Write a structure and sequence with these properties.
The structure is cut from a larger assembly and holds chains A and B.
Chain A lengths: L14 H10 L11 H11 L4 H9 L7 H12 L4 E2 L5 E2 L5 E5 L5 H11 L3 E4 L6 H5 E5 L6 E5 L1 H4 L3 E6 L6 H5 L1 H6 L2 E6 L2 E6 L2 E7 L20 H4 L4 E5 L5 H13 L8 H13 L4 E2 L1 H16 L15 H16 L5 E2 L1 H15 L19
Parallel strand pairs in A: 3-10, 3-11, 4-7, 7-10, 12-13
Antiparallel strand pairs in A: 1-2, 5-6, 8-9
Chain B lengths: L1 H10 L6 H13 L9 H12 L6 E3 H11 L3 H13 L3 E4 L4 E4 L2
Antiparallel strand pairs in B: 1-3, 2-3
Classes of the chains: A alpha/beta, B mainly alpha.
GO molecular function, one term (chain A): single-stranded DNA binding
GO biological process, one term (chain A): mitotic DNA replication initiation
Subunit structure (chain A): Component of the MCM2-7 complex. The complex forms a toroidal hexameric ring with the proposed subunit order MCM2-MCM6-MCM4-MCM7-MCM3-MCM5; loaded onto DNA, forms a head-head double hexamer.
Chain lengths: 376, 104
Amino acid sequence: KVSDKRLDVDTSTIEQELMQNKVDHNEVEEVRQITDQDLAKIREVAAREDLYSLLARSIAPSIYELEDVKKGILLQLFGGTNKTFTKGGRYRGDINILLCGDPSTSKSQILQYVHKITPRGVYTSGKGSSAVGLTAYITRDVDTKQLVLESGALVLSDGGVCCIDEFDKMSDSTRSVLHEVMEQQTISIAKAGIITTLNARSSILASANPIGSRYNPNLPVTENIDLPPPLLSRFDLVYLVLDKVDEKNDRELAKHLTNLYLEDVLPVEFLTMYISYAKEHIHPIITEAAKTELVRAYVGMRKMGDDSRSDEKRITATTRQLESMIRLAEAHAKMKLKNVVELEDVQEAVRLIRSAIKDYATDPKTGKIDMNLVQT
Amino acid sequence: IRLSQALAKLRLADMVDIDDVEEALRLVRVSKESLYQEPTTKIFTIIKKMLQETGKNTLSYENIVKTVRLRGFTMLQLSNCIQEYSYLNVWHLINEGNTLKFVD
C-alpha cells in the first residue's frame, strides 16, 4: 500500500484502522520508512533560501506556466489544518480551486498530473455524470445473485482530490449534490435500503470554459462564465488564465516545447517524501499578530465595491473568503516546517487571493481588465 | 510539429528537415484560402459619414459592422479596408476590436 512516486494516505482519516492493525498483528505497512540520512537531507533542503520558488518549480517540471498557478496546487497538496472540537463539530482544511480561462491552455495537464500524484482520486467529465453515479447505487452481484450497496465517485474520493472537467456544462441536478460536499464534507442518503450519512473529505479542482470563442476583457467576469454568481463564491481560489500575444514569452515557450523533442529541481521521490513528512508531523497554530491582519484584510475586502453590489459586476465577498485566508495561511505555515503562522503567511495569502483573480488590473467601476497591464 | 513528423516518417528518415516544416506551413495556410475569393473608398466614405453625425474620435465597431452590412458588402471587404488604412496611419483598432479611433 505504498509507492515512491505517490503521496502517503492521510492518517487523520484512518486513525482507528491503525489501532486495529496492531491488535490484529498484520504487518501490512501503510506509511513509508524514513532513515536519518534522508531526514537530515529534509532539513538541509528546508533551510534553503529559495524553498518556495524551488517547490513551485518542481511541481510540474514540464508545464511552462505562471508560478502563481503552480503555487496554488502546491498549497492544495499540503492542505489546511484539520481541527476537531470535543463537543462535536468538525472543521476541515480542504482547498477548492477553479481554473477559468481561454481554451488552448495547459489546464487539462494540471488536472491529470494532480490525479496521478494524489493517493485517492477520480476523474469526471461535465456532461457524463449523474447524481446516482456520484453518490451511491444498488447492484446485483453475479456471484451471490443478491443486492449490495456500492460506493460512488465522491465517496471513493475521501481523503483525496476529485477533478471535475468542464464544470460549466453540468446540469443543475448534478451540481446540487456538490453544495453539501463543499459545506460540511458529508452526504446524506435516504433511499430504499440505506438511511445514513457518509464521509466525503475531498478536494475539488474544477476547470470551466468561457462563453463564446475567447474571454472578452470588455465584459465583466460574471457575464463570461455560465455559472450562477452565488456559486462562484464557494471556491477558495479562482484563476483567470488569460492569453496575451507578447514576443519574449512566445519565444521562451517555443524553445521550451522544442527542447522536449530532442533525444535545478527536486526529483519526484524527494518532493513526495517532503510533502508526506510535513503533512504527517507538524501542525500549525495561529497567533494574535496574524489575527489583527486577518480581520483588517477581511474588512478592507468587504468595504471595496460596497456600492457595486446591486449590479453583479465583480464577485461579492463573503465569509468563505475569510476562511480561505485562514486555510492558505495555515498551508503556507505547514510548508517550510513551522508550527507558528506569522504575519508573512497572511500577507502571502492575501497577495495570492488577489493575484489569482487579477485584481491588479481591474477597473472597480466597470469590471474590465486592461490587457496592457497583464504581464507574463 | 506533428505534421513535420508525419512527413519525415513518409521519407523514412531519422532527422527532421526544414522543407518538411515548409510543407506543413503551406497546408495550414492553404486550409482557409476559399474565404479570400472575390470597395475600399466607398466603405471609407461611409465610415467618415457616421463619424460626423456623432462628434468624437471613438466609434463602436459593432455599429460599423451592422451599418455596412445593410448597405450590402462582404466581411472580407471590411477587413481589407481596416488593415490597409491602418497601415496608412489614419486609424487604429483598440480594446481587442471594440472601438475605432482616428489619429488626430
